[PDB]
Amino acid sequence: EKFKFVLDYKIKELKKQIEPRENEIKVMKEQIQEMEAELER
Amino acid sequence: EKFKFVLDYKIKELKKQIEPRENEIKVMKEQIQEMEAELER
């Protein structure tokens, strides 16, 4: 169970951080691209 | 073997996921300010 605890904490604790940082990166590239397009305009 | 690498990778990889996201948000949120200043000027 000692391993089971650490492994299930790997399952819950890491991917949950990946999903929001992925959506952050998506917003970060959206804002970068629209920044460059409208700035050039 | 499998216990050692998977358990140590849980801690090391999760720390590695933490440090980028916090720098990503800091840098890009300052970049939002730079965008809005230039755009309105």
């Binding site: 629209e34 409208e38 305009r41 | 809005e36 755009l39 309105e40």
Partner: peptide, 16 residues
Amino acid sequence: TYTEQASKRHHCMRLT
């Protein structure tokens, strides 16, 4: 334009 939409945002802020 994006700055015009920001002017919308500003206008909503004052309305608030």
